[PDB]
């Protein structure tokens, strides 16, 4: 708008411990 | 006029479908399609869960 600037970014990393599920898959 | 028969919007049919689900068999892949890919083949998917 007034002065030309410069910004920076860094790709984030998201992970949780493997959760527990009660539903079964195959026969 | 006499008017013997009355008209309807959608037909019923004599033979219908029934189902007995098993509430412990769920696939972990939530698939998706387009909206017209949904409409035509839509309620038939939710009868054969």
């Amino acid at each position: 708008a007034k002065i030309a600037t410069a910004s920076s970014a860094r790709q984030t990393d998201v992970e949780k411990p493997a959760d527990v599920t009660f539903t079964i898959e195959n026969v | 006029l006499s008017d013997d028969f009355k008209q309807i919007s959608d037909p019923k049919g004599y033979l219908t479908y029934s189902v007995k689900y098993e509430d412990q068999f769920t696939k972990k892949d939530k698939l998706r399609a387009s909206e017209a890919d949904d409409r035509i083949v839509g309620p038939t998917v939710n009868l054969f869960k």
């Binding site: - | 892949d29 698939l31 035509i40 083949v41 038939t44 998917v45 054969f48």
Partner: protein, 49 residues
């Protein structure tokens, strides 16, 4: 059934459906189809659904 041609994750079930809708012995399809009794005016026109 067969409307759910390619919408079920049931990999086995998906097979027979394609095979039966391939052998030219059967042809599924819904919508406004061609008819013999066509354009026959009964105050209003006859269409086949």
């Amino acid at each position: 059934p067969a409307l759910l041609r390619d919408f079920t994750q049931v990999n086995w079930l998906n097979r027979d459906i394609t095979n039966m809708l391939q052998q030219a012995g059967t042809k599924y399809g819904l919508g406004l189809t061609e008819t013999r009794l066509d354009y026959v005016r009964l105050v209003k026109t006859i269409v086949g659904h």
